[PDB]
Amino acid sequence: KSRGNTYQPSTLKRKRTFGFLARAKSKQGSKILKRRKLKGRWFLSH
Amino acid sequence: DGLRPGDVVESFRRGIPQTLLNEAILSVKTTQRGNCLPISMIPIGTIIHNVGITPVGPGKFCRSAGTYARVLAKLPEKKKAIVRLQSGEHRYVSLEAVATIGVVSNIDHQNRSLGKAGRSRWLGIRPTVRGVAMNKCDHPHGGGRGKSKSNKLSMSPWGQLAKGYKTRRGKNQNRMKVKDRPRG
RNA sequence: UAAUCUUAUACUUAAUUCUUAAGUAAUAUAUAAUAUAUAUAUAUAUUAUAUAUUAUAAGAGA
RNA sequence: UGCUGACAUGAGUAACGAAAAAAAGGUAUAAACCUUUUCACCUAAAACAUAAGGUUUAACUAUAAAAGUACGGCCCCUAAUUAAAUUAAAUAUAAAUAUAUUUAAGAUGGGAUAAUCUAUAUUAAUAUUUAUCUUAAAAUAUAUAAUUAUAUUAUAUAUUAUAUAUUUAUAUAAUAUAAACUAAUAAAGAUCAGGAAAAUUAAUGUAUACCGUAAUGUAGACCGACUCAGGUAUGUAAGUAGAGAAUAUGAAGGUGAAUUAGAUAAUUAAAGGGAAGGAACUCGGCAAAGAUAGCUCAUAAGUUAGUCAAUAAAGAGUAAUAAGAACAAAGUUGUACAACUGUUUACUAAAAACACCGCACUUUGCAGAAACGAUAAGUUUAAGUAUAAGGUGUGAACUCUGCUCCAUGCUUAAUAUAUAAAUAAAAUUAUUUAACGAUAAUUUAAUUAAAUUUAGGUAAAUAGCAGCCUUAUUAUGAGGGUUAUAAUGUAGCGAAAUUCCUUGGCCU
RNA sequence: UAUAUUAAUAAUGUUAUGAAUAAUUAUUAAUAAUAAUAAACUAAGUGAACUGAAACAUCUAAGUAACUUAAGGAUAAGAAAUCAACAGAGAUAUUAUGAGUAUUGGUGAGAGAAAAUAAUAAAGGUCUAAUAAGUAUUAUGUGAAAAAAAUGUAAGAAAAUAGGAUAACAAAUUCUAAGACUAAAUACUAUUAAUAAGUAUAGUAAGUACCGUAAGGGAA
Numbered sequence A: 001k002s003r004g005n006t007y008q009p010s011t012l013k014r015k016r017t018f019g020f021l022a023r024a025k026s027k028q029g030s031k032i033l034k035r036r037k038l039k040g041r042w043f044l045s046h
Numbered sequence B: 001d002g003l004r005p006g007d008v009v010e011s012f013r014r015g016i017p018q019t020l021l022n023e024a025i026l027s028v029k030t031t032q033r034g035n036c037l038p039i040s041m042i043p044i045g046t047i048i049h050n051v052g053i054t055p056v057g058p059g060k061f062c063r064s065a066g067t068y069a070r071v072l073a074k075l076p077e078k079k080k081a082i083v084r085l086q087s088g089e090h091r092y093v094s095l096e097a098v099a100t101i102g103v104v105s106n107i108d109h110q111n112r113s114l115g116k117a118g119r120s121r122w123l124g125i126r127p128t129v130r131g132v133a134m135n136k137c138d139h140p141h142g143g144g145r146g147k148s149k150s151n152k153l154s155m156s157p158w159g160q161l162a163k164g165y166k167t168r169r170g171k172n173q174n175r176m177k178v179k180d181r182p183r184g
Numbered sequence C: 001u002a003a004u005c006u007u008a009u010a011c012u013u014a015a016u017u018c019u020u021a022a023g024u025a026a027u028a029u030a031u032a033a034u035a036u037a038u039a040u041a042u043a044u045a046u047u048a049u050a051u052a053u054u055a056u057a058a059g060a061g062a
Numbered sequence D: 001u002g003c004u005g006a007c008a009u010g011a012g013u014a015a016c017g018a019a020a021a022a023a024a025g026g027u028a029u030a031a032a033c034c035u036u037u038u039c040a041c042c043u044a045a046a047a048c049a050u051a052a053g054g055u056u057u058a059a060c061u062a063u064a065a066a067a068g069u070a071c072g073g074c075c076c077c078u079a080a081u082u083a084a085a086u087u088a089a090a091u092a093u094a095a096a097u098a099u100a101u102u103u104a105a106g107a108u109g110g111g112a113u114a115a116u117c118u119a120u121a122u123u124a125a126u127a128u129u130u131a132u133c134u135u136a137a138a139a140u141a142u143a144u145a146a147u148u149a150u151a152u153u154a155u156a157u158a159u160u161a162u163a164u165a166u167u168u169a170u171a172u173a174a175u176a177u178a179a180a181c182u183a184a185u186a187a188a189g190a191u192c193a194g195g196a197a198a199a200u201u202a203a204u205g206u207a208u209a210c211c212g213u214a215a216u217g218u219a220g221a222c223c224g225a226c227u228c229a230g231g232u233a234u235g236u237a238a239g240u241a242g243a244g245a246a247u248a249u250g251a252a253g254g255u256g257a258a259u260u261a262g263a264u265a266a267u268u269a270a271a272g273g274g275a276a277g278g279a280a281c282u283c284g285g286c287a288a289a290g291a292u293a294g295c296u297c298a299u300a301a302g303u304u305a306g307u308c309a310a311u312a313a314a315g316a317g318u319a320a321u322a323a324g325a326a327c328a329a330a331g332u333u334g335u336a337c338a339a340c341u342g343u344u345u346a347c348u349a350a351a352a353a354c355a356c357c358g359c360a361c362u363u364u365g366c367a368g369a370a371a372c373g374a375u376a377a378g379u380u381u382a383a384g385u386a387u388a389a390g391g392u393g394u395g396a397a398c399u400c401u402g403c404u405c406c407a408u409g410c411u412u413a414a415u416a417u418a419u420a421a422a423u424a425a426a427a428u429u430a431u432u433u434a435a436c437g438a439u440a441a442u443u444u445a446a447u448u449a450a451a452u453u454u455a456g457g458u459a460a461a462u463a464g465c466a467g468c469c470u471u472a473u474u475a476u477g478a479g480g481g482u483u484a485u486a487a488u489g490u491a492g493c494g495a496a497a498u499u500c501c502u503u504g505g506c507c508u
Numbered sequence E: 001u002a003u004a005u006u007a008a009u010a011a012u013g014u015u016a017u018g019a020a021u022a023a024u025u026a027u028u029a030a031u032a033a034u035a036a037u038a039a040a041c042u043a044a045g046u047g048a049a050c051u052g053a054a055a056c057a058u059c060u061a062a063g064u065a066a067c068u069u070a071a072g073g074a075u076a077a078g079a080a081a082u083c084a085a086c087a088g089a090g091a092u093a094u095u096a097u098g099a100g101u102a103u104u105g106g107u108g109a110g111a112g113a114a115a116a117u118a119a120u121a122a123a124g125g126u127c128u129a130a131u132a133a134g135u136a137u138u139a140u141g142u143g144a145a146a147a148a149a150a151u152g153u154a155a156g157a158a159a160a161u162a163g164g165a166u167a168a169c170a171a172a173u174u175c176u177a178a179g180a181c182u183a184a185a186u187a188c189u190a191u192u193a194a195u196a197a198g199u200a201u202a203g204u205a206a207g208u209a210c211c212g213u214a215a216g217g218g219a220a
């Protein structure tokens, strides 16, 4: 069993979990977004 | 138990209807197996199943294969009826509570032997890992070199004693039980 | 046991719907009077006065 | 073993990543690019269609063309599940929030019509899993209506000839390969008992929206830091052969590569052969070698009766006698451990460990026991009800499972028995006050728990199962007498995976 | 579906008997809608641990970090049921002295006021309450290291002839709880000006490249 390939992309899943709207919808995600904005981040979410 | 397709069963939970009233004398007609009625109608001594608590609620006790209760006494003063359940616990049940006549079907269910692990899995039963097999962090019986019981009293993974320890105790006990079930 | 707890399930006035108030009709309970039937008591019918429109049923219960 | 930068050293060393290349020409510029021919490799793929993914890598900017029918999304519908949403007072909660209910979302699934092409809008009105046998039917041949042997047996279409509506329709008859495969049909075996959710006529409509479409996809175009021998879903996968998607070949298609040319010492790897011997090797037959049909027969002891053992070993038939493709097929036995098929340390342990089916104990009567819940409401348990569910040990079955409650627990009963907080009113004492009083302590009086203790019970609860003496001529010790205890190791097994002394004694 | 209805008209074509029913266009009137909003400062809730004590358990770190909630340009506090001591002062806030003093501590580690006098400060006093009860007080459990005011559970007053304040009591003194408002000095952010024995690795790029599934990290 060879490791290394732990990332296994699937756009839909990514957008569900780490997408902007998911962040927006949760309180915790909204807080994250705010924190990133404060930092100065160009890209707040996937 | 002896029910087979073609048999006829009534239910006298509402009461004795005007068909049978127009046409004890009624008790023997009524107390055929398979038909339901309040414990008031059911004569003392006879075997029953799907025994209720309350006069309105459904039959709760004695539902499993080959199981049954038995009417022991009835008290119209207090509106109760002492019933022996399958466990052996004598218990007050509302005198107007529901109960079917006869023993439950499939008496020989208990005698089945599952052949293999897979059958249990199909039924929906994942494997039980023994406390002695575990590590100490996981279960009190765990740890030790070789196989050991750690001088630890037989108990659950959360420290509740497994052999003999009465779990329903003190104030929170059953109010309606007349005589407790036979133990050991 | 109206301590606690558990379970189940019409019209008319005044500020299209909404709410108040009055009286009336309908149902239920309590109290008083009259008539009838049974063994001072119980049941039924009629009249007057008062109250109501979270409930009812089941269970546990100081 | 400071941090950052720059540059050395090893060193022009190893390596250049499974590989088959050759010539001619594009080009008097080519080992590496393009073409042609030859040769090879993959071929139930290294092919052809696709899914997901991605720096568009593509046959490219003059760029991947859809009203719908062996076209997908979008849309309708819902599953798993999700939701600062939903209900003077839904419930709970230090806040955050959590729960229940509604509603909404949510594909991996379901969704009308269609080449004789098809019309989706609006308005109105009342389907787990597997199987297709046997029988029976008729057909074809042998023998003398009936027997024997052999295939065929529900559906799928063109042709010809009839009979009815009128060359277009409906029905009937006859003609017509084998082996796979599909869909749709029917009947039906087994227990493990098999999703959810969204009407029909009539009239009036319908100018048909958006997005996906390249190429790559067992890979140089994704996930692995690399153009990485790893990981990566689905469908076709020429024939010949075969039981087959095994194995050989390879029609077609694709490919022959960011390393080449030579040389082939020692040495290493991965292969091929080997005289005489045949485990003498070694910790150990590790490794290697070993297959005298794969079809049809036949196949023992033992045994839990299961061709379990068995794919038995040997052996036969067919084939072959000097041999002459690949692939499947690699002995027999004794003992230890574990019933068995399974599971396990992803990346050093696959086991004797876990699990298991069975066995036993125990808890809980359901407004239960168990678990979860800053901690609740509540949830699972369960749409179950003691033949159930939770916990514990043991681990199929045969023969069996002895004695012991001392201790730690659990469990039952005793006002046997102490102590905690909680109370009236009233007695001295102390402080203060000129006095009563005020403020402190202390002591009295009825009504006291669970706990503890005592006595049972409970060991398939946690646990335990002693030593000395010396008696039948010597020996052995059936016996005999003691001490100690809760009881004093029973059946069995025994130098055991348990035996230190130990390479115990004896046999094979 | 607001280049929407719904109605009222006007123009057009069709149906059935001048009037009625539907469709299309054009005016007039009527009907709802758009959260991207700071961060720091403040107040409230919950509240660690490392650490110190040369161990560690009371204690400490600390009501700190953190998370959560809510407000305003500031917030908080504020016109004595305050301090003091027989003399007196007169809201609050910040600083200096008082003072590392009183006080307190497994009397260890260590913690530590107030009165008073100075500044800074603004006009700093002024009713808005028919004067405050399950309140004061008591018991008990907790509660800013000293100094309380708070608080869960339950008992529970008094009218200025009274009530609060100190172990307690007696004298005295002082204040009036259970109703309220309040600039100003202060905090933080931004801007402008001035001063730099500050910065060119604290001198403008970039929260980019790149790393990570993600929170997040982060160059030259």
Ligand SMILES: [Mg+2]
Binding pocket: A004
């Ligand atoms: Mg990685």
Ligand SMILES: [Mg+2]
Binding pocket: A017
């Ligand atoms: Mg997920």
Ligand SMILES: [Mg+2]
Binding pocket: B127, B128, B129, B130
């Ligand atoms: Mg187990």
Ligand SMILES: [Mg+2]
Binding pocket: B133, B134, B135
């Ligand atoms: Mg273990």
Ligand SMILES: [Mg+2]
Binding pocket: B136, B139, B140
């Ligand atoms: Mg533990």
Ligand SMILES: [Mg+2]
Binding pocket: B146, B147
């Ligand atoms: Mg052992």
Ligand SMILES: [Mg+2]
Binding pocket: D002
């Ligand atoms: Mg240095």
Ligand SMILES: [Mg+2]
Binding pocket: D013
């Ligand atoms: Mg060298």
Ligand SMILES: [Mg+2]
Binding pocket: none
């Ligand atoms: Mg060299």
Ligand SMILES: [Mg+2]
Binding pocket: none
């Ligand atoms: Mg080399």
Ligand SMILES: [Mg+2]
Binding pocket: D030
């Ligand atoms: Mg050339």
Ligand SMILES: [Mg+2]
Binding pocket: none
């Ligand atoms: Mg093959």
Ligand SMILES: [Mg+2]
Binding pocket: none
């Ligand atoms: Mg392809």
Ligand SMILES: [Mg+2]
Binding pocket: none
């Ligand atoms: Mg939906």
Ligand SMILES: [Mg+2]
Binding pocket: D107
């Ligand atoms: Mg789908």
Ligand SMILES: [Mg+2]
Binding pocket: none
């Ligand atoms: Mg494509």
